[PDB]
């Protein structure tokens, strides 16, 4: 990859550090969703796992991502503020 | 239309041109019947005979008028289900039709505007009129149609795989997974959710989707 | 008495039971002549009975009814200017229409509604009577006379109390326009109270933004003068005073964007109060919050209009939604083209917050589709969370199938013809196909073109072109220059930005000339080729396998790709050769497409077409004589035939073209024109500056259902083409071209006709400046 | 192949909805159960006594 | 040339031009462009043997009578009209009492120009267009205006005695309701279709009685020459609505003792017991005071834009805004004389003064008609 710039890979929908600190492990989904709302990706398979996830690449200069998922229990009470970075 | 004639004069000159296949001269006299006699005793049948005239003149939304002008104005016949058939039968050909077929490119991944309506009417046939002979096409005309809804919706999961908006892959897929219980494009939506999760490093969440592939192998 | 049976006479639109239940004495009820008179009114209270005559056979009812329903016809008459259907709406307002229950009680509200409709037309002397005329078995005719007395025109909006604005210069920029003498016409001056309401709001937006917060329009007295035409509008207003927008108190829900939400509300404290800036600095914040994913960007200013210093202070109430907004996207109106081909026009992604601009940049990319007619969006906020938006980019595709042809003799002089047909990405494939070609008895041309416009999601247009030009210029033979120039020309498109989209490609131009005409520019470039062949005979060849490099780039900001009204397309394309090519040249060229609306109604729109080019040799060569520039004759300037802008080819003294035709194709030959002639065909120039100035113009007599697809375009077209090697050496006692002073001109009208086979442009011009060597074809009809 | 006084042509079309029989059903393992249907997707199958398509009753 | 370009209209011209006393103007001294296409009055007041007369150009003349020769000629200015410093374009006609030529403007003004030089001895602004001629009585320059306001201004120095809205019309149904003082009430009609008597002391509503409808969706005559101005012959109060529906109200309560709601009378005088009136058909007719008993009528006059039927030279003269004068048989309706002295004609009432019939037309404004 010798490209320094092309039209960039992009995304939004990823938790701010406010949104991480707005909530706690123990906080209910609704109580999490008070200023976080709902993600644009949750888990149909397992539990309430609220993936607020970023993706980006600035012209083949290393692809960026911010996978800030919220693993709740099935009661919707938060069990994990799972905030994965790029790669 | 014929002038202010007796209704059965207009009904006969409607009915012959149905049997002639002269559907315009049916509609010429199906509606000049209903011009001064829409309270004709056969105006329920005339509405069906209009759908018999319109759809066999390929006047599909005009059939879809007379399909609803059956069920709205004079629904008194057991061809409400035919009308529920012809509603979708209008709506199925109303959505995906083009001259691009002799060269070999797709219609089903396109937008399903009337096709979602044919998805409704042929469902409303097999739900609201499940007795009917018309359910027989209608059951079949849901099956491709949800896949026509799927291969439309799969195209966005296909495109957002290319975009690198990997949330947006799963946004179509998990929506499709929630939508379609049997369509192949949903089973082919299925790994793209896992694929996108792995780019978003939801690799464990991706393997939740991979075991669906272990179940949608079945 | 008890009715034994009822006689139901004359119904024909209503039933027996529609009569019978509206009989208060129904069959079997005790009947009275009181109940009979109860029956007469209540059957007439159907509204579907022209007359009711209830009688009895002792007690046995017998009800005799003529009825006014289903109307056989509705006639309009005396409507000299106003169309009859516009009047029919006021009949359909009054429930009177063909094949329907007439109510002859509703004869008047037809008319009174119509004269009050006529009041709102821009008349008031315009009257109407409706005529009820019964017809078979129920039917009626509803004839209407229309007494169109006179229209109404605004005369002078007498805006009294006007203390910062002269109303007269306001009317010149109002909507109610004036000054129609026999030396000035802007359009008619009909009485439009609706324009007048906008005129007082033009007056409001005249005042309010200067300082005039407490400007107020006090009263408004329309001159209801006994002419029903002369409308003056005695408006009382009060200037108030200049206020100063003197504070900004922007607050509310700002969602961590608080800094620029101040800055999107910047005033200076004391700025002479701009009411429009107050509203502006609201939406300044709104799109900003809409970029974060808040299309709940509720931003509400509040000028605390402080007359204690004649100022205002702008409180602003800002709401900044919740994040993560665009849940997903949809498309619609692409039942024929695959939605993901249209989704890769889009820039707003799912799994994102709302970029409101991201929604519209791809919609602007959808606006620059070209295989469309209109594009919309539908930004449905999905409820349940203010992170949830589905954006339905509802679009509308374009026509499919376009044809072209050519003529000049067929079917009796051999088989000589031209062809061409287009698919227009046929019904939305993702495969653009347009195919042409011609086989004559003087030449045979072959060319191909196919494009996969979205081979890659970056915007990669997989488009290839090849060509075999078996062109001989047969007099009966190579007696007029052959050019077997063949090969390929493939080009790819690459967007690096959303308006910036690059192009590049290669050219294999396997030229094979023979028996070249003794016009010097053939040899003059061949003298730069190192060839010095026969000035005096067309026996000479020219072969070059021109390995050329093509390039290009577009700026795409002209809105529609279908029928624009505004924007600018800046589209580059040029060529250059490489080492290894059998000729070392370049050619750079640039065209544009810019739509400038004259009025803001955008049916008066300037169209800018201008062509500039240059090319010469990269080293030791020229850009070819067959690569020189041209115009004229439906190219830029009309009123000519083709190749009337450029160096006009000057001949060497010639004898024989290997059969020079005897006083035909004469070229300073032995068969005429002898010894250094010059024909009036352009060999054209290595430089170019040619243009055309057309206009989107309204047609008030063409229905605008297709006059938005018909671009009636008046023009004055002009331009010059010169060679920087046509300097006055051999073309010295001949037309010399060395500069942009060789300008041709013509003016006329282009008439773009959007057929089902596409736009058809027919033109007519008069060459008002015609340079040297220009043919004249005023009547130019193109398909 | 060669025109013989008012020949005719050939066109193309589609009716594939008529022949479609319910496709390979999506499943899910335990702990991973996607909802299979969020609409009228799951075909409420009836095939009562008649043909498929325009061969069926016309009026 | 210009014939095939445009569209068509309709009207009704004058039949039976009569000359049984052959009429003529005695002088011709025209102010300028006279009444105009605003609902305007430019009624020439003849005092000092001088026709103080104005037009809708701001130009006020002093046409010294028996020749109409100019004693003075001024052009008046406005102050708020479209910006400021604009000609008067007078809506109110010329009133003259004392050294005061009172004319009311279409923009906002009501004047009083000194009757030797026409210098504005005072002007006092009214709210909007002065719908009435400045009716000058009892220290009050009483104007009913475009905003439905009975406005009383001081006739010596200029001072608003009051401004009281009575019947504001809808947009402005332009009704000269010109305030005539009767029984202590400045009786002043209603431009939306009413009539009022309003107390002349300070503008107190003695009564306002709705007579006919408003123009617009209750469609009555805008095309009438509106004389909502009550001609109060005794307290059976003869007056008009906006369409001109003649009504005979009580003077202290508005009790309509009879009416020609049936009529939509354009111009009317009540000549004692002879209500000589230009009807909606522009039929000149005579009615009683205790009823609209048609003492005579006239179909010789039929849809000309008529003036008021006034007795002069032995016959009931009525001009029009088509310039046709018409000397009516006062006893029954017949054209005795006809003088088409203008063609733009008189939207001012025929001033049967100076031994002439002084008029103001719109183009050939101030003549003086004789027979």
What does this structure look like?
The complex is a heteropentamer of chains A (87), B (218), C (783), D (59) and E (371). Chain A is an alpha+beta fold and 87 residues long. Chain A has one domain (17-84): Beta-lactamase Inhibitory Protein, Chain:B, domain 1 (2-Layer Sandwich). Chain A contains two helices and three strands. A three-stranded antiparallel beta sheet of chain A has the order 1-2-3, with no helix packed on it. In chain A, a hairpin with a 7-residue loop joins strand 1 and strand 2 (64-72). The N and C termini of chain B lie far apart (59 Å). Chain B has a domain at 1-77: Alpha Horseshoe (Serine Threonine Protein Phosphatase 5, Tetratricopeptide repeat), CATH 1.25.40. By secondary structure, chain B is mostly helical. Chain C has six domains: 8-66, Ubiquitin-like (UB roll) (Roll), CATH 3.10.20.310; 73-151, Ubiquitin-like (UB roll) (Roll); 153-238, Ubiquitin-like (UB roll) (Roll), CATH 3.10.20; 244-318, membrane protein fhac (Ubiquitin-like (UB roll), Roll), CATH 3.10.20; 328-397, membrane protein fhac (Ubiquitin-like (UB roll), Roll); 404-781, membrane protein fhac: a member of the omp85/tpsb transporter family (Porin). In chain C, strands 19-20-21-22-23-24-25-26-27-28-29-32-33-34-35-36 form a 16-stranded antiparallel beta sheet, with no helix packed on it. The longest helix of chain C is centred in the middle third of the chain and has 17 residues, at 275-291. The radius of gyration of chain C is 37 Å and the shape is extended. The termini of chain C are far apart. Chain E has 371 residues and is an all-beta fold. Chain E has strands at 24-28, 45-47, 50-54, 59-64, 69-75, 95-96, 101-102, 109-113, 120-125, 135-137, 140-144, 149-153, 160-165, 180-182, 185-187, 194-199, 204-210, 236-240, 246-250, 258-260, 267-268, 277-278, 284-285, 310-312, 315-317, 324-328, 335-340, 357-358, 367-370. In chain E, a hairpin with a 5-residue loop joins strand 18 and strand 19. Chains in contact: A-B, A-C, A-D, B-C, B-D, C-E. Chains B and D meet through helix 3, helix 5, helix 6, helix 7 and helix 8 of B and loops of D. Chain A: Part of the Bam complex, which is composed of the outer membrane protein BamA, and four lipoproteins BamB, BamC, BamD and BamE. Chain A: Keywords: Cell outer membrane, Lipoprotein, Membrane, Palmitate, Signal. Chain A: Its main location: membrane. Chain A: It comes from Escherichia coli O6:H1 (strain CFT073 / ATCC 700928 / UPEC). Chain A: Belongs to the BamE family. Chain C: Part of the outer membrane protein assembly complex, which is involved in assembly and insertion of beta-barrel proteins into the outer membrane. Constitutes, with BamD, the core component of the assembly machinery.
SSE layout and pairing:
The complex is a heteropentamer of chains A (87), B (218), C (783), D (59) and E (371).
Chain A: H1 17-22, H2 29-36, E1 49-56, E2 64-72, E3 78-84
Antiparallel strand pairs in A: 1-2, 2-3
Chain C: E1 8-9, H1 16-20, H2 33-44, E2 51-57, E3 60-66, E4 73-77, H3 84-93, H4 107-121, E5 123-134, E6 140-151, E7 153-156, E8 159-160, H5 167-171, H6 193-207, E9 216-222, E10 230-238, E11 244-252, H7 258-263, E12 271-272, H8 275-291, E13 299-303, E14 312-318, E15 328-332, H9 339-343, H10 356-367, E16 372-375, E17 379-381, E18 389-397, E19 402-403, E20 417-422, E21 432-439, E22 443-456, E23 460-471, E24 482-495, E25 500-514, H11 520-529, E26 542-556, E27 567-577, E28 586-597, E29 605-614, E30 648-650, E31 678-682, E32 687-696, H12 704-707, E33 712-722, E34 744-755, E35 758-769, E36 779-781
Parallel strand pairs in C: 1-3, 4-6, 7-10, 8-10, 11-14, 15-18
Antiparallel strand pairs in C: 2-3, 5-6, 9-10, 11-12, 13-14, 16-18, 17-18, 19-20, 20-21, 21-22, 22-23, 23-24, 24-25, 25-26, 26-27, 27-28, 28-29, 29-32, 30-31, 32-33, 33-34, 34-35, 35-36
Chain D: no helix or strand
């Amino acid at each position: 990859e010798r490209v320094v710039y092309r039209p960039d890979i992009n995304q939004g929908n990823y938790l701010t550090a406010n949104d991480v600190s707005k909530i706690r492990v123990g906080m209910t989904q609704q109580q999490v969703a008070y200023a976080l709302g709902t993600p644009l990706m949750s888990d149909p398979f397992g539990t309430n796992t609220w993936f607020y996830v970023f993706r980006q690449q600035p012209g083949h200069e290393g692809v960026t991502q911010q996978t800030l998922t919220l693993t709740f229990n099935s009661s919707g009470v938060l069990t994990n503020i799972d905030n994965k970075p790029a790669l | 239309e014929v002038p202010d004639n007796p209704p059965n004069e207009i009904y006969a000159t409607a009915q012959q041109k149905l049997q002639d296949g002269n559907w315009r001269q049916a509609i010429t006299q199906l509606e000049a019947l209903d011009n001064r006699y829409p309270f004709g005793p056969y105006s329920q049948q005339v509405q069906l005979d209009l759908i018999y005239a319109y759809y066999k003149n390929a006047d599909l939304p005009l059939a879809q008028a007379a399909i609803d002008r059956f069920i709205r104005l004079n629904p008194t016949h057991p061809n409400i289900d035919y009308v529920m058939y012809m509603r979708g039968l209008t709506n199925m050909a109303l959505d995906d039709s083009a001259l691009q077929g002799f060269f070999g490119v797709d219609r089903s991944d396109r937008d399903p505007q009337h096709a979602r309506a044919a998805f409704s009417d042929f469902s409303k046939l097999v739900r609201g009129y499940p007795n009917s002979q018309y359910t027989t096409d209608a059951t079949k005309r849901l099956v491709f149609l949800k896949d026509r809804l799927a291969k439309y919706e799969y195209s966005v999961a296909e495109y957002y795989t290319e975009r690198g908006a990997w949330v947006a892959v799963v946004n179509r897929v998990e929506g499709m997974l929630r939508d379609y219980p049997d369509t192949q494009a949903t089973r082919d939506a299925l790994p793209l959710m896992e694929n996108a999760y792995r780019q978003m490093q939801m690799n464990a969440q991706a393997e939740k989707v991979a075991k669906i592939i272990a179940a949608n192998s079945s | 008495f008890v009715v034994k049976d009822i006689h139901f006479e004359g119904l024909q639109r209503v039933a027996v039971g529609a009569a019978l239940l509206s009989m208060p004495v129904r069959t079997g009820d005790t009947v009275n002549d009181e109940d009979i008179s109860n029956t007469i009114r209540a059957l007439f209270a159907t509204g579907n009975f022209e007359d009711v005559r209830v009688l009895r056979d002792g007690d046995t009812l017998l009800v005799q009814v003529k009825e006014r329903p289903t109307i056989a016809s509705i006639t309009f008459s005396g409507n000299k200017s106003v169309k009859d259907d516009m009047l029919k709406q006021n009949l359909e307002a009054s429930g009177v229409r063909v094949g329907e229950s007439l109510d002859r009680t509703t004869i008047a509200d037809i008319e009174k509604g119509l004269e009050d409709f006529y009041y709102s037309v821009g008349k008031y002397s315009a009257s109407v009577k409706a005529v009820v005329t019964p017809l078979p078995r129920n039917r009626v005719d509803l004839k209407l006379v229309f007494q169109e007395g006179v229209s109404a025109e605004i005369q002078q909006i007498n805006i009294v109390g006007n203390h910062a604005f002269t109303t007269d210069e306001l009317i010149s920029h109002f909507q109610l326009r004036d000054e129609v003498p026999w030396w000035n016409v802007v359009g008619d001056r009909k009485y439009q109270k609706q324009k007048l309401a906008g005129d007082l709001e033009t007056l409001r937006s005249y005042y309010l933004d200067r300082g005039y917060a407490r400007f107020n329009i006090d009263s408004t007295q329309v001159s209801l003068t006994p002419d029903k035409k002369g409308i003056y509008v005695t408006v009382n207003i009060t200037e108030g005073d200049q206020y100063k927008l003197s504070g900004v108190e922007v607050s509310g829900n700002l969602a961590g964007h608080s800094a620029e939400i101040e800055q999107l509300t910047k005033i200076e404290p004391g700025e002479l109060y701009n009411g429009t800036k107050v509203t502006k600095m609201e939406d300044d914040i709104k799109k900003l919050l809409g970029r974060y994913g808040y299309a709940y960007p509720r931003v509400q200013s509040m000028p605390e209009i402080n007359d204690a210093d004649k100022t205002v202070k702008l409180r602003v109430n800002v709401d900044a939604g919740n994040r993560f907004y665009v849940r997903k996207i949809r498309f619609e109106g692409n039942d024929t083209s695959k939605d993901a081909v249209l989704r890769r026009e889009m820039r707003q992604m799912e799994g994102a917050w709302l970029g409101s601009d991201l929604v519209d940049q791809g919609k602007e990319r959808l606006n620059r589709l070209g295989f469309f007619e209109t594009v919309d969006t539908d930004t449905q906020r999905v409820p349940g969370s203010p992170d949830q938006v589905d954006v339905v980019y509802k679009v509308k595709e374009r026509n499919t199938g376009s044809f072209n042809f050519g003529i000049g003799y067929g079917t009796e002089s051999g088989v000589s013809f031209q062809a061409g047909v287009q698919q227009d990405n046929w019904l939305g494939t993702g495969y653009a196909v347009g195919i042409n070609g011609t086989k004559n008895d003087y030449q045979t041309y072959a060319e191909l073109s196919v494009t996969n416009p979205y081979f890659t999601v970056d915007g990669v247009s997989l488009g290839g072109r090849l060509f075999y030009n078996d062109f001989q210029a047969d007099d009966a033979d190579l007696s007029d220059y052959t050019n077997k120039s063949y090969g390929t020309d493939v080009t790819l498109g690459f967007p690096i930005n959303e308006y910036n989209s690059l192009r590049a490609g290669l050219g294999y131009v396997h030229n094979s000339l023979s028996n070249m005409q003794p016009q010097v520019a053939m040899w003059r470039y061949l003298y730069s080729m190192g060839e010095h062949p026969s000035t005096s005979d067309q026996d000479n060849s020219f072969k070059t396998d021109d390995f050329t490099f093509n390039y290009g780039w577009t700026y795409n900001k002209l809105d529609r790709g279908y029928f624009p009204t505004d924007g600018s397309r800046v589209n580059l394309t040029g060529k250059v050769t490489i080492p290894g090519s059998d000729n070392e040249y370049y050619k750079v060229t640039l065209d544009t497409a810019t739509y400038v609306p004259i009025d803001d109604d955008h049916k008066w729109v300037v169209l800018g077409r201008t062509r500039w080019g240059y090319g010469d040799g990269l080293g030791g060569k020229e850009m070819p004589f067959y690569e020189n520039f041209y115009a004229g004759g439906s190219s830029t300037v009309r009123g000519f035939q083709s190749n009337t802008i450029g160096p006009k080819a000057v001949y060497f003294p010639h004898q024989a073209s290997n059969y020079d035709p005897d006083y035909d194709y004469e070229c300073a030959t032995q068969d005429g024109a002898k010894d250094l002639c010059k024909s009036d065909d352009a060999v054209g120039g290595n430089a170019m500056a040619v243009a055309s100035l057309e206009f989107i113009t309204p047609t008030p007599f063409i229905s605008d259902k297709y006059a938005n697809s018909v671009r009636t375009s008046f023009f004055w077209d002009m331009g010059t083409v010169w060679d920087t090697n046509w300097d006055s050496s051999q073309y010295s006692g001949y037309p010399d071209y060395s500069d942009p002073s060789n300008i041709r001109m013509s003016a006329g009208i282009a008439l773009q006709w959007m057929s089902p086979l596409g736009p058809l442009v027919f033109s007519y011009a008069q060459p008002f400046k015609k340079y040297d060597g220009d043919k004249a074809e005023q009547f130019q009809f193109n398909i | 192949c060669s025109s013989d006084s008012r020949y005719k042509r050939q066109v193309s079309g589609d009716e594939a909805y008529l022949e479609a029989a319910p496709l390979a059903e999506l499943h899910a393992p335990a702990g991973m159960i996607l909802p299979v249907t969020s609409g009228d997707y799951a075909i409420p199958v009836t095939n009562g006594s008649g043909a498929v398509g325009k061969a069926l009753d016309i009026r | 040339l210009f014939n095939s370009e445009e569209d068509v209209v309709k009207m009704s011209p004058l039949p039976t031009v009569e000359n049984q006393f052959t009429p003529t103007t005695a002088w011709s001294t025209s102010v300028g462009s006279g009444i105009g296409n605003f609902y305007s009055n430019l009624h020439p007041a003849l005092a000092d043997n001088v026709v103080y007369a104005a037009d809708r150009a701001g130009l006020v003349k002093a046409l010294n009578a028996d020749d109409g020769k100019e004693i003075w000629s001024v052009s008046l200015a406005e102050k708020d009209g479209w910006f400021s410093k604009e000609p008067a374009l007078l809506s109110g006609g010329v009133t003259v009492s004392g050294g005061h030529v009172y004319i009311g403007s279409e923009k906002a003004q009501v004047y009083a120009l000194n009757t030797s030089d026409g210098t504005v001895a005072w002007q006092t602004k009214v709210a909007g267009e002065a719908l009435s001629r400045p009716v000058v009585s009892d220290g009050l320059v009483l104007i009913h205006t475009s905003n439905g306001q009975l406005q009383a201004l001081n006739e010596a120095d200029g001072a608003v005695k009051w401004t009281v809205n009575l019947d504001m019309p809808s947009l402005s149904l332009r009704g000269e309701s010109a305030p005539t003082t009767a029984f202590g009430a400045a009786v002043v009609g209603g431009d939306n279709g009413r009539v009022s008597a309003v107390l002349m002391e300070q503008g107190q509503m003695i009564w306002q009685q709705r007579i006919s409808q408003a123009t617009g969706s209750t469609e009555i005559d805008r095309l009438s020459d509106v004389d909502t101005t009550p001609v109060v012959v005794n307290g059976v109060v003869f007056a008009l609505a906006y369409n001109g529906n003649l009504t005979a109200l009580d003077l202290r309560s508005g009790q309509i003792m009879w009416k020609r709601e049936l009529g939509s009378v354009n111009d009317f005088i009540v000549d004692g017991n002879r209500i000589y009136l230009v009807d909606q058909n522009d039929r000149v007719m005579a009615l009683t005071i205790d009823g609209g008993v048609t003492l005579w009528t006239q179909s010789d006059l039929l849809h000309r834009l008529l003036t008021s039927p006034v007795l002069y030279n032995g016959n009931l003269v009525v001009g029009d805004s088509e310039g046709y004068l018409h000397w009516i048989n006062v006893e029954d309706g017949r054209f005795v004389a006809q003088q088409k002295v203008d063609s733009s004609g008189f939207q001012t009432e025929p001033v049967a003064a100076d031994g002439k019939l002084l008029i103001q037309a719109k183009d050939g404004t101030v003549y003086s008609i004789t027979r």
